[PDB]
């Protein structure tokens, strides 16, 4: 089991890792967390240890100061960690390895970090001319999937061209055989569960010449 | 670094894992060996531990009784193991993980187990007729690469047909436009660095009818 944990950038991830001891488990309690980041191909890197009743946490410089055991009494049965001020670079697989010999247990977490849509650009791809085919595009610079789009007409009738109604919730509107009546100011609003962004374009459909 | 170790079936593998302690390493000495076998897709399975100055070795039933720490004073700086009576099924990646907090070190071994050639079959693939094309094949049932082959003629002239001289060290001899003179008893001897096998065939090249 690889449990998915999903949080937004800047929030804190809780990676729970509670454990029961068998009375047979007489060896010293030893706990190791390791990361395998997405951003690169290093694998199984120690980020924090509990060993000899002491915490060692100076391991992985990208996580400096941001990884802590959740509990104030780890030896009672809680190996959970907090990862605070989440960065996009913290996306990866986190493994909790608990040992109290002969007992050994592991668990993995797949951490994803979400970001709201931002830097969203609204633009026309093509010549804005009567009879032409061109494209209305709403392109976020950043934004975690799944993303929702919604075009609206801000100017004049405040009503989207009927032929475009099917692509109204799409990032791209593929305009065919353009009418001058399609002209106007249009808004693209993009959202995901973190947040929202909006942009605007002006369409001016003129005779081709 | 993934150090290759190669031994023959029934021999003992030595997987060295000596370590130096830094005087800063004050946590308890903790050693873990894990296997990731080729034969299946289980990964990172504990085969033996040194924890709290005690050995725990009842982990991986295929290795029962066959994994031991090499040294009688492991804590002095020797995490090496012996794997005795090697089976083909022991082929895999072995990892030694040494910890004495804050110090942590790992090393991997890629274990391969060699077997001599055996069950070698010598046979003609095709009709043994004047004018025909057919094949002399020497097929071991088992045998670790790299393998060497050598055909010889045992009968009559004790000399291989001149046209076959180029395929004399090949497991397959591709006979073209067969002469009756090609007839005879031929030996195929196959070897690798572990051992040897030999087989024999009788070629009787007769008129096609």
- Does residue A110 sit in the same domain as residue A121? no
Q: Among candidates B85, B54, B52, which has minimal Cα distance to B67?
A: B85
C-beta of residue B50 within 8 angstroms of C-beta of residue B59: no
The total number of structural domains in chain B stands at 2
Exposure string for B35-57, b = 16+ CB within 10 A, e = fewer: bbbeeeeeeebbbbbbbbeeebb
CB nearest to A101's CB, from B52, B99, B104: B52
* B176 exposure class (CB count in 10 Å sphere: 0-12, 13-18, 19+): exposed
CB nearest to B28's CB, from A52, A102, A106: A52
Taking only Cα atoms into account, the Rg of chain B, rounded to an integer number of angstroms, comes to 26
DSSP A110-159: EEEEE---BS-EEEEES--BTT--EEEEEE-SB-PSS-EEEEEE-STT--
How far is Cα A34 from Cα B122, in angstroms, rounded to an integer?
A: 54
Q: Among candidates B140, B6, B41, B27, which has minimal Cα distance to A29?
A: B27
How far is Cα B134 from Cα B124, in angstroms, rounded to an integer?
A: 7
End-of-domain residue from the set A78, A96, A115: A115
Exposure string for B89-119, b = 16+ CB within 10 A, e = fewer: ebebbbbbbbbbbbbbeebebebbbbbbbee
- Does residue B83 sit in the same domain as residue B171? no
CB nearest to A52's CB, from B27, B49, B56: B27
* Shortest Cα distance, chain B CAs vs residue A48, angstroms: 10
- A81-83 β-sheet, strand order: A13-15, A81-83, A67-69
How far is Cα B149 from Cα B66, in angstroms, rounded to an integer?
A: 35
End-to-end Cα separation, chain A, in angstroms: 64
- Does residue B3 sit in the same domain as residue B100? yes
- Does residue A72 sit in the same domain as residue A137? no
How far is Cα A20 from Cα A6, in angstroms, rounded to an integer?
A: 26
- Does residue A189 sit in the same domain as residue A147? yes
Total number of residues shown for chain B: 209
Torsion of CA B177, B181, B185, B187, to 10 degrees: -60
CATH classification of the domain holding A148: 2.60.40.10
Dihedral sign, CA of B12, B16, B17, B21? positive
CA distance readout (Å), A189 to A114, A120, A165, A172, B32:
18, 9, 15, 12, 54
Residues of chain B with Cβ-Cβ distance to A46 below 8 Å are 104
Residues 6+ apart with CB under 8 A from B23: none
Query: Is B28 in Cβ contact with A102 (below 8 Å)?
Result: no
Query: Is B101 in Cβ contact with A52 (below 8 Å)?
Result: yes
Which residue carries 């670790």 as its tokens? B144
DSSP A57-105: ----GGGTTTEEES-S-GGGTB--EEE-S--GGG-EEEEEEEEETTEEE
User: Which residues are registered as beta bridge partners of B54?
Assistant: B51
CA distance readout (Å), B13 to B4, B83, B112:
11, 5, 10
User: Which residues are registered as beta bridge partners of A32?
Assistant: A49, A97
Q: What does the block give as tokens for A18?
A: 């509670």
Residues of chain B with Cβ-Cβ distance to A35 below 8 Å are none
How far is Cα B135 from Cα A148, in angstroms, rounded to an integer?
A: 66
End-of-domain residue from the set B115, B148, B177: B115
- A121-125 β-sheet, strand order: A121-125, A134-139, A172-175
C-beta of residue A84 within 8 angstroms of C-beta of residue A66: yes
Q: Residue A200 gets which letter from DSSP?
A: E
- Does residue A22 sit in the same domain as residue A61? yes
- Does residue A94 sit in the same domain as residue A131? no
- Does residue A56 sit in the same domain as residue A110? yes
For residue A166, the SS3 value is helix
- Does residue B130 sit in the same domain as residue B107? no
Q: What does the block give as tokens for A168?
A: 């109204």
Query: Is A26 in Cβ contact with B52 (below 8 Å)?
Result: yes
Which residue carries 């729970």 as its tokens? A16
C-beta of residue B7 within 8 angstroms of C-beta of residue B114: yes
Q: Residue A22 gets which letter from DSSP?
A: P
- Does residue A125 sit in the same domain as residue A166? yes
How far is Cα A187 from Cα A158, in angstroms, rounded to an integer?
A: 10
Q: What does the block give as tokens for A22?
A: 């068998």
C-beta of residue B62 within 8 angstroms of C-beta of residue B86: no
- Does residue B179 sit in the same domain as residue B96? no
- Does residue A11 sit in the same domain as residue A110? yes
Query: Domain range spanning residue B175?
Result: 116-209
- B172-175 β-sheet, strand order: B121-125, B134-139, B172-175
Residues 6+ apart with CB under 8 A from B109: B2, B3, B4, B5, B15, B93, B94, B95, B96
C-beta of residue B12 within 8 angstroms of C-beta of residue B85: yes
Interface probe for A, chosen from B31, B46, B102, B107 (most Cβ of A below 10 Å), is: B102
CA distance readout (Å), B10 to A7, B67, B84, B85, B144:
53, 14, 7, 4, 14
For residue A28, the SS3 value is coil
CB nearest to B28's CB, from A26, A28, A58: A28
C-beta of residue A78 within 8 angstroms of C-beta of residue A70: yes
CA distance readout (Å), A144 to A88, A141, A188, B89:
11, 10, 17, 45
Dihedral sign, CA of A155, A159, A162, A167? positive
C-beta of residue B189 within 8 angstroms of C-beta of residue B143: no
Query: Is B49 in Cβ contact with A101 (below 8 Å)?
Result: yes
User: Which residues are registered as beta bridge partners of A54?
Assistant: A51
DSSP B11-45: S-EEE--B-PPPTT--SPPEEEEEEEESSSS--SE
Q: Among candidates B99, B51, B25, which has minimal Cα distance to A104?
A: B51
* Shortest Cα distance, chain A CAs vs residue B56, angstroms: 6
C-beta of residue A167 within 8 angstroms of C-beta of residue A160: no
Q: Among candidates B128, B123, B87, B93, which has minimal Cα distance to B108?
A: B93
Query: Is B104 in Cβ contact with A51 (below 8 Å)?
Result: no
Beta strand pairing call for A54-56 and A45-51: antiparallel
Q: What does the block give as tokens for B29?
A: 């000495």
Dihedral sign, CA of B5, B9, B14, B17? positive
CA distance readout (Å), B60 to A170, B43, B201, B205:
54, 12, 45, 56
Q: Among candidates B102, B115, B62, B77, which has minimal Cα distance to A60?
A: B102
């Amino acid at each position: 089991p690889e449990q998915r944990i999903e949080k937004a950038k800047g929030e804190t991830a809780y990676l729970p890792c509670k454990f029961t001891l068998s009375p047979e488990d007489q060896g010293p309690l030893d706990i190791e967390w390791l990361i395998s980041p997405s951003d690169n191909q290093i694998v199984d890197q120690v980020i924090i240890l509990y060993s000899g009743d002491k915490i060692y946490d100076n391991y992985y410089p990208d996580l400096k100061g941001r990884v802590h055991f959740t509990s104030n009494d780890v030896k009672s049965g809680d190996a959970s960690i907090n990862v605070t001020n989440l960065q996009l670079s913290d996306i990866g697989t986190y493994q909790c390895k608990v040992k109290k010999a002969p007992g050994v247990a592991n668990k993995k977490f797949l951490l994803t970090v979400l970001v709201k849509p931002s830097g969203t650009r609204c633009f026309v791809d093509g010549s804005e001319e009567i009879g032409n085919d061109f494209k209305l595009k709403c392109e976020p610079k950043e934004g975690s999937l799944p993303l929702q789009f919604e075009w609206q007409k801000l100017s004049d009738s405040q009503t989207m061209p009927t032929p475009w109604l099917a692509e109204m919730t799409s990032p791209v509107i593929s305009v065919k055989n353009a009418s001058s009546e399609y002209s106007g100011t249009y808004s693209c609003t993009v959202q995901n569960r973190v947040g929202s962004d909006q942009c605007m374009l002006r369409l001016d459909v003129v005779p081709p010449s």
